[PDB]
Amino acid sequence: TDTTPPTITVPSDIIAYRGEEFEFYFEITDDSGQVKNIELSTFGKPLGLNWLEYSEDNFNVPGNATSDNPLRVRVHGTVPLNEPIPADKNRAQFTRTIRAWDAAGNVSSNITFVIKYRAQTDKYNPADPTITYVDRLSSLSPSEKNAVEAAVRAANPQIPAAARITVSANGTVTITYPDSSTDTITANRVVKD
Amino acid sequence: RRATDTTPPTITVPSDIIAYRGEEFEFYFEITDDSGQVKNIELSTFGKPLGLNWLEYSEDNFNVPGNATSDNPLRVRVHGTVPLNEPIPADKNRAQFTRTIRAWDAAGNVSSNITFVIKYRAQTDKYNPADPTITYVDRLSSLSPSEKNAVEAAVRAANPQIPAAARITVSANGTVTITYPDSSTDTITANRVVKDLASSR
Ligand SMILES: CC(=O)N[C@@H]1[C@@H](O)[C@H](O[C@@H]2O[C@H](CO)[C@H](O)[C@H](O[C@]3(C(=O)O)C[C@H](O)[C@@H](NC(C)=O)[C@H]([C@H](O)[C@H](O)CO)O3)[C@H]2O)[C@@H](CO)O[C@H]1O
Ligand SMILES: [Ca+2]
Ligand SMILES: [Ca+2]
Ligand SMILES: [Ca+2]
Ligand SMILES: [Ca+2]
Ligand SMILES: [Ca+2]
Ligand SMILES: [Ca+2]
Ligand SMILES: [Ca+2]
């Protein structure tokens, strides 16, 4: 007779960037080999994360949750592009809980997991462009600005196509990501006389 | 038959030479001589130095018999690029250089200097941007980075004739600036560039 609830392993470093789909897995095991269902909540209260979704593939099937082959629950979602980021990054997160139960109805305690979220510039780190030679380092021409932007773009296919690259009069590059966070490339990585 | 050539060459000048800063241009002088041969030319400022180091011409076929007949005149190709930064005064018509040309035949006769005028203008005078296909945006007063990219691409697509070296910028409200290589500009007002997505869907 099964009187023992499932056990749940959560990922330690769920880090999501605004506006960009994330995914992670829960792993659930039960001594019976079978997990019936799970529930995501805020310590038992409503989850309150309508942009998060998880798959219920293979729920409630014998053998779906053994020590060797745990039930691997795919969770995905997109933190809103305009999600405010608190000044203290330790509060830029969502703390939530998961519980799970077996076919006998033994329910686990609430297990904590944390979704940290960050501005897109915390993900992206622009690579060096090929240097653009300019006539005046203090007053780039329109052609030179075009060349700088093209070189930054060619070096950074990994940056969203939707980010906008601007170039100031002295060759300083600003990259503005879709979520309005930014990176800067100092002119000395960009232009030479 | 007169014993000697005493008649200098005759030069025809182009009447409407118009150059845009930063863009190569060319024009032709046509020269004939009663002997059929023109030895060389001089471009000057009424006999003083030309003072236009960006003006060039080929001496191909100079001083060859038969190079300068009525049926087959000497065609002198003059070409160059007015500097990107050449100053254009408040009166755009003052943006011109009046210079002189003369030519020698092979008998020592040199024509008297005649004038020609190189007018030069800003590039925005040459280029007239077509309006882009409308970009639909969420906030007319604050375009997103992808909306500014989209506007720029639309302006670029609607204007293949504009130079690739022109830089297209987009303001917060979708006002477009096209800055040509010589830093002259054209503007497209926001109401011809962007429209609110919700109002229009
Ligand atoms: C008799 C004789 O040989 N005298 C010439 C004298 O005529 C000449 O003065 C120039 O004359 C021409 C007309 O034939 C023009 O009026 C010149 O003015 C301009 C020009 O068209 O070249 C006006 C123009 O606005 C100016 N451009 C700019 C950008 O400012 C130019 C410019 O000052 C010079 O051409 C660049 O050197 O001038 C007028 O000056 C003079 C020399 O030009 O030579 C005498 O012997
Ligand atoms: Ca159990
Ligand atoms: Ca399995
Ligand atoms: Ca960054
Ligand atoms: Ca980082
Ligand atoms: Ca651009
Ligand atoms: Ca002659
Ligand atoms: Ca124009």
3-state secondary structure B91-124: CHHHCEEEEEEEEEECCCCECCCEEEEEEEECHH
Instruction: Output the six-digit token pair for A120.
Output: 């897109």
Q: Which amino acid is at B190?
A: A
Q: Measured between CB atoms, which of B145, B169, B179 is closest to A177? A: B145
**Hey, are the CB atoms on B149 and A143 less than 8 Å from each other?**
no
- Resolution of this entry, Å: 1.7
Q: Are B92 and B63 in contact (CB under 8 A)?
A: no
> How far apart are alpha carbons B142 and B170 in whole angstroms?
11
User: Testing the interface with B: which of A141, A159, A179, A181 to mutate, by most B Cβ within 10 A?
Assistant: A141
Confirm or reject contact between B149 and chain A (CB < 8 A). Answer: yes
Protein residue with least CA distance to atom 6, ligand 1: B46
Angstrom CA distances, B3 to B97, B103, B107, stand at 41, 22, 12
List the determination method: X-ray
Q: How many angstroms separate the CA atoms of A116 and A91, rounded? A: 9
State the fold for domain B129-201: Ubiquitin-like (UB roll) (3.10.20)
| Domain ranges for chain B | 1-128, 129-201
Sheet with B17-20, strands from edge to edge, namely: B17-20, B114-121, B96-105, B38-44
- DSSP per residue over B6-22, as a string? ----EEEPPS-EEEETT
Does residue B188 sit in helix, strand or coil?
Answer: strand
Question: Residue ranges of the alpha helices (H) in chain A?
Answer: 120-123, 142-155
Rounded distance between C-alpha atoms, residue A96 and residue A113, angstroms:
5
Q: Is the CB of B160 under 6 A from ligand 1?
A: no
Which are the contacts of A33, defined by CB distance < 8 A and separation ≥ 6?
Answer: A62, A63, A64, A65, A66
Contact A6, A37 (CB under 8 A): no
Does B181 lie at the interface with A, CB-CB under 8 angstroms?
yes
Give the CA-trace dihedral at B127, B130, B135, B137, to 10 degrees: 60
Q: A69 C-alpha to center of ligand 3: Å?
A: 5
Q: Tell me the Ramachandran region of residue A63: left when phi exceeds 0, alpha when psi lies from -120 to 50, beta otherwise.
A: left
Virtual torsion, Cα A89, A94, A95, A100, nearest 10 deg: -150
Contact B101, B11 (CB under 8 A): yes
CATH architecture of the domain with range A126-193: Roll (3.10)
DSSP bridge pairs for B97: B118
Q: Measured between alpha carbons, how far is A49 from A56 in angstroms, rounded to an integer?
A: 17
- Count Cβ atoms within 10 A of the Cβ of residue B31 and give its class: 0-12 exposed, 13-18 middle, 19 or more buried: buried
Q: Is B92 in the pocket of ligand 1 (CB under 6 A)?
A: no
In angstroms, the separation between the Cα of residue B145 and the nearest Cα of chain A is 5
Please, which residues bridge with residue A182 across strands?
A176
The DSSP string of B122-147 is: -HHHH--PPPPPPEEES-TTS--HHH
Q: For chain A, what's the residue count?
A: 193
> CA A60 to CA A105: how far, in whole Å?
11
For ligand 1, atom 29, the nearest C-alpha belongs to: B95
